[PDB]
């Protein structure tokens, strides 16, 4: 109810398309004198909102928050994230963040997920492409509730129906399609790997279908050259086949902050 912001407050710059999605494109906005991201929803809507309304209660420095929505293809207002998504940023030929900085972003994602895990929310699509950065280089775990979409179709394979992020998905999800907090831990492992390779595509010489047999043979992603061993030991623990022996997010926050603390820059 309070989520519903009035139409005269929100401006939407349709020519400046900042993101692109399946359900709708993400246009630039200016709510009045603050900057915004306005996500459309062109192409179910009744069902999508009731799950989304719970988003407003959530607040945490490393989780994306809801500013509001405007009814009229209803528009979803979201805080403007200056430095874009995290997959685009670490690849960006401009900012050269250190190994420490990359481990810092990963630690920040651990805290966003620790929060959401404490609320019993399963993300289901945790990846560098679905995490944003603000002016202060704070990582915000996004793509959940009303912000939920596909923002880069290449990493989603098309019998089931709904398109799945196979290369980020854990072994039980690939076989069953049942997602959990311990499955989200697998995805986090893959995301950490992205940070240490600076946004390299996981499993470059592998088809979208073939990851289940690949993983079952006893294979994992290799250790990146500048990935410090302890972090590789963490990455491997996240891909433990028993979704039980995998580490909790509170343990991930604890262990990674220890690793982060051992660097200069
Ligand atoms: C060159 N260009 C200059 C402008 C820069 C800043 O532009 C922005 C782009 N997007 C936002 C934004 C903010 C809040 C919420 C969302 C919605 N949302 N989007 C994505 C998303 C956005 C873009 C690319 C990809 C991928 N792959 C994924 C993921 C999760 C999610 O929840 C978007 N803000 C600013 C980017 C670089
Ligand atoms: Cl930090």
Residue numbers in the entry: 1067 to 1098, 1104 to 1114, 1120 to 1148, 1152 to 1237, 1240 to 1346
Task: Reproduce passages from the article.
The receptor tyrosine kinase MET is activated by hepatocyte growth factor binding, followed by phosphorylation of the intracellular kinase domain (KD) mainly within the activation loop (A-loop) on Y1234 and Y1235. Dysregulation of MET can lead to both tumor growth and metastatic progression of cancer cells. Tepotinib is a highly selective, potent type Ib MET inhibitor and approved for treatment of non–small cell lung cancer harboring METex14 skipping alterations. Tepotinib binds to the ATP site of unphosphorylated MET with critical π-stacking contacts to Y1230 of the A-loop, resulting in a high residence time.
Further mutations outside of the ATP pocket including F1200I/L and L1195V affect potencies of type II MET inhibitors such as cabozantinib. In contrast to the WT and Y1230C proteins, which contained mixtures of the 0P and 1P forms, the recombinant F1200I and L1195V protein samples indicated the 2P form as major species present after purification and prior to additional autophosphorylation. In SPR studies using F1200I and L1195V proteins without ATP incubation, we observed the presence of high affinity (F1200I/L1195V: KD = 0.5/0.3 nM, residence time = 2.9/18.5 min) and low affinity species (F1200I/L1195V: KD = 23.4/80.3 nM, residence time = 0.8/0.5 min) for tepotinib binding as expected based on the presence of multiple phosphorylation states. In the biochemical assay with the F1200I and L1195V mutants, we found reduced affinities for tepotinib (IC50s∼300 nM) in comparison to the WT. The A-loop was nearly completely defined, except for H1238 and D1239, comprising a similar conformation as in the WT structure also regarding Y1234 and Y1235 positions, which are both unphosphorylated. Based on our tepotinib-bound F1200I crystal structure, we conclude that the F1200I mutation does not directly affect the A-loop conformation and is not involved in tepotinib interactions. Structural modification within this hydrophobic cluster by F1200I mutation might explain the shifted αC-helix position and disordered JM-helix observed in the F1200I•tepotinib crystal structure. The F1200I mutation might also indirectly destabilize the A-loop conformation via F1134 in connection with the DFG-motif residue F1223 causing an enforced A-loop autophosphorylation.
